[PDB]
């Protein structure tokens, strides 16, 4: 069959939460894993992280930021609509060890993505500091939810409209310069943010893991669309990750590859917008 939307919540402008009926995925999903979805028969497959699960309801939760045609179209869906295809849980679960103090860094929709990982880290006994990065105050979401699974939360806005002014990396650099004990940094967000976090921590030798976000098609290892270079070796993020040692990732290659379809992505979005103008 298809996959019923049980609930939709607008968390912030352009940030839409969907609770989806999928008892198989709910039963098996672990923090860090993702799904591929396809909305309808003409659609493309896109990856989205499993931000929460509810085994008692047989549901999973995904949070999709509006960035282009597929996520804008998804943003119009309501409870009782259906997602045609949902494949999961995909990827390797995040590795949850007692590390000591873990700094969890979520940028934008990455704040939803880090929630299950932060929760698992906390349940394993780690001291958890969550740095949340947003562009501006109206995009802030899930502060209380992250606080519920963290020992400390630092909210940043680029423009200083709420919390600490600056980037995620400004908050992290402040912790380092204060001499705070940090045993692991986990980063999830835009590739430019994950690269910046990795470059900040590398001179300090702080173990840093990033959840990579390359282009995906099947999501099961068949094709290499999602390939990355890690420690000089080709890996397929959907099956070998998507989490890797951030200090071994070829960030410039990843960002180059993510830009390949920009012109076609614009054409597709423009067509969808043009064909919805009359009302």
């Amino acid at each position: 069959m298809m996959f019923k939307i049980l609930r939709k919540e607008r968390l912030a402008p352009g940030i839409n939460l969907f609770e989806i009926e999928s008892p198989r995925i709910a039963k098996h999903a672990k923090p860090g894993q993702f799904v591929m979805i396809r909305l309808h028969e003409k659609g493309e497959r896109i990856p989205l992280t499993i931000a929460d699960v509810d085994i008692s309801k047989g549901s999973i939760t995904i949070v999709a930021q509006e960035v282009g045609k597929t996520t804008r179209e998804l943003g119009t869906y309501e409870a009782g609509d259906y997602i045609l295809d949902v494949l999961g849980p995909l990827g390797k679960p995040s590795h949850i060890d007692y590390f000591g103090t873990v700094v969890m860094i979520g940028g934008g929709v990455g704040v939803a993505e880090i929630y299950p990982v932060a929760k698992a880290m906390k349940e394993k006994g780690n001291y958890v500091i969550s740095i949340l990065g947003f562009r501006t105050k109206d995009l802030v979401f899930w502060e209380d939810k992250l606080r519920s699974v963290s020992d400390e939360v630092i909210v940043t806005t680029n423009d200083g409209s709420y919390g600490m002014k600056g980037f995620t990396t400004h908050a992290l650099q402040k912790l380092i310069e204060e001499g705070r004990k940090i045993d692991l940094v986990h980063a999830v967000g835009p590739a430019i943010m994950m690269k910046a976090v990795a470059e900040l921590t590398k001179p300090y030798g702080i173990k840093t893991v990033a959840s990579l976000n390359p282009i995906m098609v099947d999501g099961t290892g068949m094709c290499g669309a999602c390939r990355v270079t890690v420690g000089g070796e080709v890996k397929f993020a959907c099956v070998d990750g998507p989490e890797f040692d951030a200090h071994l990732v070829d960030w410039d290659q990843l960002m180059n590859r993510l830009a390949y379809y920009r012109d076609l992505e614009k054409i597709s979005l423009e067509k969808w917008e043009r064909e919805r103008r009359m009302v």
């Binding site: 098609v217 094709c223 669309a225 379809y261």
Partner: protein, 471 residues
């Protein structure tokens, strides 16, 4: 006997029309042409006929041909009797007649091909299946099979919905089992749906088999990656037996410098985007695909030919870059010829050394090493030997088609399953794996092979499952 040495030709669409779309190139026989071709067959005795020995499942080729000739005046009866004969050994004749490498199989063995053109067995088999489908004759025979089903109460799971799994499922259903197929992608068909393009395997032919499975009472669950969505142990608890038909779906990638430059695709990615996601219809369909003005396709098999001919249909100038010569290529001869006709350019005795990019990370050129032929290797073909001479050729896009291999990620998670060093599941003479009650077939046990072998293994495994569960 006297021999009519020239084949009756099948009509094909013109190159100029067909390079503008993904529609089927070869239009197949009409009844009148098929009957004329059938008349060329010498009707060698079944207990000798070399075409039968060359068919991997030993279809009674002279018998089905005879059924056409003996019913010259009643095409529906002719086709019904011919299809009945074929279906004794082959579930997928509309597919295999189109895609078998017959020059290495039935037709390569046909006696008429020693002095002229072999009997066009594949096109006759295709004709029987296609005519039957167009006239509901296959449905008639299928309903006849369905009447004979006696449900036995036992449940079997199939992992993978390619030709092996689809075939195994149908045979088990006919034996009375309650069958569920689990498929990771959003549509079933395996390579038949995502790999081989519509210009030689129309999706209608695969969809017909899915309709047949619906009528047989088989359940198909898509979006199930076994090992993740459902565990293998969960299947063992719920099912009386399992058949693993997971193919060889991971790309082989050689560590060429520059292979991650933009514009370089595996053939699996390129073909999946084109065939499964209909990217050639972008932006009507949402999945994009990008080819530059000049495309290189690395390899010489069917995958390479399919990628090259697909890229040509997107408007590019396309080169096959192959490390041996024409004689050694492994693609179907008919499709090499179609590629030549359509304007694919061929460069032989070359292999990539590295891919060269521009400033923005986009492919700009390929440095190629020249090769020379040496002694025959294990396959009996002269091996390629590098000469040390290299040169640089400009390209905007490259498609890597150097083979596929099984997914070790899935395989390692299957508790207790023995797999060889090439990723092939080890099976006994009954296609049973190291886990009792778990069987395997197709590319999962052979590495990349053929549709007909996957079909044959699915039927053999169904019989073995029945024996195992009946004892």
């Amino acid at each position: 006997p006297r021999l009519i040495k020239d084949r009756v030709p099948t009509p094909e669409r013109s190159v100029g029309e067909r390079v503008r779309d993904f529609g089927e190139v070869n239009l197949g026989y009409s009844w009148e042409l098929a009957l004329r071709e059938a008349e060329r067959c010498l009707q060698c005795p079944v207990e000798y006929a070399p075409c039968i020995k060359g068919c991997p499942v030993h279809i009674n080729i002279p018998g089905f041909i005879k059924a056409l000739r003996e019913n010259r005046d009643n095409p529906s009866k002719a086709v019904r009797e011919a299809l009945r004969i074929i279906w004794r050994d082959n579930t997928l004749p509309a597919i295999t007649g189109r895609v078998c490498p017959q020059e290495e199989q039935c037709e390569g063995a046909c006696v008429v091909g020693k002095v002229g053109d072999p009997i066009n067995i594949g096109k006759l088999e295709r004709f029987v299946a296609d005519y039957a489908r167009e006239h509901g004759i296959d449905d008639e025979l299928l309903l006849e099979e369905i009447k004979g089903i006696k449900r036995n109460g036992k449940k079997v799971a199939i992992i993978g919905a390619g030709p092996a799994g689809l075939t195994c499922a149908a045979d088990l259903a006919k034996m009375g089992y309650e069958v569920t197929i689990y498929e990771a992608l959003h549509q079933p068909g395996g390579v038949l749906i995502y790999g081989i393009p519509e210009f030689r395997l129309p999706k209608e032919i695969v969809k017909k088999e899915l309709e047949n499975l619906r009528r047989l009472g088989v359940k198909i669950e898509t979006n199930v990656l076994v090992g993740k969505t459902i565990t293998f142990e969960e299947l063992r608890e719920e099912y009386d037996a399992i058949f693993i038909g997971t193919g060889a779906g991971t790309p082989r990638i050689y560590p060429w410098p520059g292979v991650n430059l933009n514009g370089i695709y595996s053939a699996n990615e390129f073909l999946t985007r084109i065939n499964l996601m209909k990217a050639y219809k972008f932006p009507e369909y949402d999945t994009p695909i990008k080819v530059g003005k000049r495309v290189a396709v690395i390899g010489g098999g069917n995958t390479a030919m399919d990628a090259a001919r697909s890229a040509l249909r997107l408007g590019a100038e396309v080169w096959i870059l192959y490390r041996r010569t024409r004689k050694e290529m492994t693609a179907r001869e008919e499709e090499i010829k179609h590629a030549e006709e359509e304007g694919v350019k061929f460069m032989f005795l070359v292999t990539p050394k590295r891919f060269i990019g521009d400033e923005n990370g986009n492919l700009k050129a390929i440095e190629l090493e020249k090769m020379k032929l040496g002694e025959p290797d294990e396959s009996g073909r002269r091996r390629p030997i590098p000469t040390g001479e290299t040169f640089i050729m400009e390209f905007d896009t490259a498609i890597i088609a150097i083979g596929q291999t099984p997914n070790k990620t899935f395989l390692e998670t299957v508790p207790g399953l023995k797999v060889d060093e090439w990723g092939r599941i080890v099976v006994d003479e009954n296609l049973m794996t190291s886990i009792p009650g778990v069987f395997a077939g197709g590319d999962a046990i052979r590495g990349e092979a053929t549709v007909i072998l996957a079909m044959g293994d699915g039927r053999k495994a169904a019989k073995a499952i029945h024996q195992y569960l009946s004892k």
